[PDB]
Structure formats: C-alpha cells, structure tokens
Symmetry: D2
Subunit: 147 residues, 4 copies
C-alpha cells in the first residue's frame, strides 16, 4: 500500500525523502530508518539471483539554496547512492544493484500542490529482471520470415 506499487515491468517500494533523510538538502539517512533498509535488504537476499534492484532518486522542482548540490540531478543521485550503499552494508550483492537519478523528471503527480511536491521527493527501489525470451523469439522469427 503506502509503500508498494506494481508497474507492468516490475515492482516499486516508495520511500519518502522527508522520512528517510536528515534534512531537505542532505543525503544522510535517519538512524531510526536504518533497519527498514535492512528489512528491504533481507527480502532482496531471498529473491532469485536474476532479480535486479535499481535504486531511483527523484526530487520535485523546488530550487534549493545554501547547498553544495548544483542540480536536482546531483541531489537525487546522492540520495539514491546512499540508499544503495546501505543495502550493500546489509548484505545485498553489488552485482544486483544500480542507482539512478531522475532529478525533477517523471513526477508521481504534477507539481501543482504541496501534497504532490512532497510525493515527488522520494527514493524508489525498483525490482525487475532482464527477461529476454520474447526478444529471442522475435529475432528467430525475423531471421526466418523477413525477406
């Protein structure tokens, strides 16, 4: 519910930035949230090795002052990287992990309200696989029938 959402090519755990991090321009994780990341790490470790985990950082488009970060892309990158590193510290194999920065792109909801702007400041843990059976079927048929 509040955390889990399904999309057609994988699953998403949505972690609000204001809950996860120390302040609005920080990439340090709140100590009382560390074992929630461990909880996620433990579930990942039980999944098949073929599952990939992409830790995705997003911001809204509120400009930020008095910070070392010079773009929403940089802030989002540092946040996603931090969460990814903690997953590794709690036992997830790095061969299953990547991080992404979306900056202010791909918002959950339009940046048209205070509620929506807060929704857009989040880290998403995206679970998927690199399934290619359909692609391989198509390539074989293409070889045969494409004149």
């Amino acid at each position: 519910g509040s955390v889990l959402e399904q999309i057609d090519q994988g699953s998403i755990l949505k972690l609000p930035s204001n809950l996860l991090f120390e302040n609005a321009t920080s990439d340090a994780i709140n100590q009382d949230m560390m074992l929630y990341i461990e909880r996620i790490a433990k579930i990942i470790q039980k999944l098949p090795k073929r599952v990939h985990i992409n830790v995705r950082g997003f911001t809204d488009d509120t400009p930020l002052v008095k910070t070392r970060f010079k773009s929403h892309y940089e802030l989002a990158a540092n946040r996603a990287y931090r969460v990814m590193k903690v997953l590794i510290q709690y036992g997830v194999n790095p061969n299953q992990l990547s991080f992404s920065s979306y900056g202010s792109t791909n918002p959950i909801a339009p940046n048209d309200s205070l509620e929506n702007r807060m929704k857009n400041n989040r880290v998403e843990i995206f679970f998927s696989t690199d399934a290619n059976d359909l692609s391989k079927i198509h390539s074989i048929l293409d070889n045969e029938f494409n004149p």
Copy 2:
C-alpha cells in the same frame, strides 16, 4: 515484414484469409499454402518448450449469406482451428497449441475501406510465454510490506 509483427507481449505471424483458405466462407486450406504452415511448424519445433502458440482467427464485419456459419465468431473459430490442426499434423506438440476466435473484434485497422476490411480477415499465429517472475516478485513484496 508483410507477415511478422512484434507486440510487447509476443510475436505475430499474420496470414491473410483470402490467401490461406479456399473461399470467403470456407475453412479448407489451399493446397499450395500447406507447406507454408509446415514451415511455421518447423520453426516452432526448434523454439523452447516454454513457448506457447495461440492461433487467432479474425474476420471483418461483412455479413455472409448461404453459409452454415451463423456468426463471425463461428467462422473465425473454424479457421483458427483448421490452421492449428495443420500445425499438429506437421509435428507441433498439442501441449503448446490453442486456438482463439475474435469474430469481428480487435481489427488491425478500422472497417472504413476495402483495403482495411481485407486486412482484418486473417489468422494470426501468436507466440508468447507465461512468464511470471514479475508477478512472483510482487506477491513476495506484498506479503512483507502490505500491512
């Protein structure tokens, strides 16, 4: 090209009914097309066992007189069934085969021109798999995080 098309959940070989069958209300395959079905059967036999083949019948919405068939669903069903049976005769395991009837539904193109009506009279051989890795991932996450 003319025959092969990819969609996001599988591949399609499109066989025009006017080329494949004896006449507009017949389900008998033209003798000079039989080894084209064999050609398809041979490619299927080389694919992994996990591939399923659904032979899909479609019509346009031209009414038909002086026929034993009482609906587009019945005509489409008989045509798809015939092609499926020939695939079995040429060696495809029945455990990989089903047939479908769409009647006049799901047209390729709107029934607004002679060219489009002819396009809509076809049998599609649909190749896919019952992949469920993403569904299983989601079920595991749902167990854990849905309060």
Copy 3:
C-alpha cells in the same frame, strides 16, 4: 443434468480464483462454478450469481482491456456425438460463458474465446477439485500494447539497415 460430483464439491479446496502472469490477469473458474457437468456446455443457471459479479467488475475496467474466455478439458472421453474433439468441447464451453458475459452487459467489442483442448491426463489420486480445475474456464485480461515494439523498430531500422 447436474452431476452428483458437480453438486457435492466444496469450495474450500479450490485453488486461488485470481492468478497473475506478467502479461495479464486470469480468473480461474472451475467447471462446477459454471456448468451442470464437465462433459457438456450446459450452464448451471443456479450458479449465475458468480458470472454476474464478473460482468459487473468488467465495467470498472477501460475499453483497452481485452477479455478472452478460455476453455480447458482433461482426457475424460467425449460423451456426446456433437463434440467431435476435446478442442471442440472446450471451445463450446468457452463460447457459452462469453455469451453469458454479453447477456450481462459486457461489450462484445472486447470479447473473444479460446480452446486449449485437453491439457491434463487423468491421474491416480487426483482430487475432485483438481478434476474441476482441469475442466475450468478462464477469463484472461490483457492488452495488445506495442509501444516498446515500436521503439525497437525505429532503432533497428536506423542502426541495423539491411
């Protein structure tokens, strides 16, 4: 008519009614929830409450959703002259359920039916629930999305010319 096994089977032992695969959703309807028996296409009119719900919930889905009614049998021998194969028997059962959905207000433009013929043998120690599942009708919900395919086509034409 209703067979003494259709009549007696409890619902507790059934598998999950809803299954998900990566390309769509499946409502699995064992024979006894739809038909008088597993060897003909005669609808049990006294079970139609369940089909009405499905029709009702199908209105909460968009026009783009495709609904495919799928028929299965096991290796039970054919009883009636009118079914010449298990493929035919399963097609008739699926078609029948599809028509009930239409009767109950589902848009015919979104409906199709399929037949898988026999897909399971008769096995020693099979439960009655497993026999009813082997003669199920499924309602399969999917789309024919081709967005990702169109992307690949554009790229393949540009970077892999013949």
Copy 4:
C-alpha cells in the same frame, strides 16, 4: 587525453550496437565511441557525430518514452582522486553523456542517468573490444506503463479482500 587503445580499436570486433530485452531497447556504446579514455569522464569531441545521430533519432520517438543513460565499469583501479568509487566514475560518465544529449536537443524531461559501478572483473585473454564494452555507456529506452497492474489491482481488491 585519448589513450593509445581508445585510438586504435577497430569497430569490426564490437558486439551488436542495439539489443532488445522484453522491457525495452538498449543502445550499447563502448567507451571508445564516447570518451577519450575508460578512466575519466572526458568526452572525445571528435566522436560526437555518433551522439548527434542518437539525439536526432530520439525525436522520432514519443514523449512517453523514458531515456535512461547507464554507466558501467570493470575492475580497472581508479586513476583520479575525484572519483572515490567505480559507482561514482560510472555515474559521472553517464551524466556527461546525458548532458550531451540535452545539448543536442533531447528533452530533459525524458532523461535520467544511472550507474552500475563495476560489473566485470579483469580476465586473462580479454579482447580490447571486451574491455571497452565493460566500460560502456548504454542508452536504455523504456516506459512506466501500468495498465496491466491496474487491471490486477481491481481484480485482487474484489476477489481477494483482506
């Protein structure tokens, strides 16, 4: 600067530039087609012809397509103080290529970048093509479609209430 291996490598031995997986398309760009070397984020300005084409073809795709620029390394040790990890090095390379796409007219609203850090060891008898592939940037084309997920949600809520 350009390293004597970036400079010399032939294109004949490269793998396919375009790969398809079931969730999207991947353009695989070995290090030498983009950067002066495999250990820094300095773009080879003399290779930018190739990036311009990609930007050009990205306009033939719809707004709904998401473009993710992905950086990879192997276990080559870090050369520069400024990269503190392979994750950081790959992120910087990916970010750099993403910015070139923006320069060349790709809508920033469709762009993101990723880093996979090191994903391959240094192996005996590796070709130079394989080293360049291990330090590639990928452009990954996908969507966040949720049509099938929304169908399942509706059905699960109705038939599997808590």
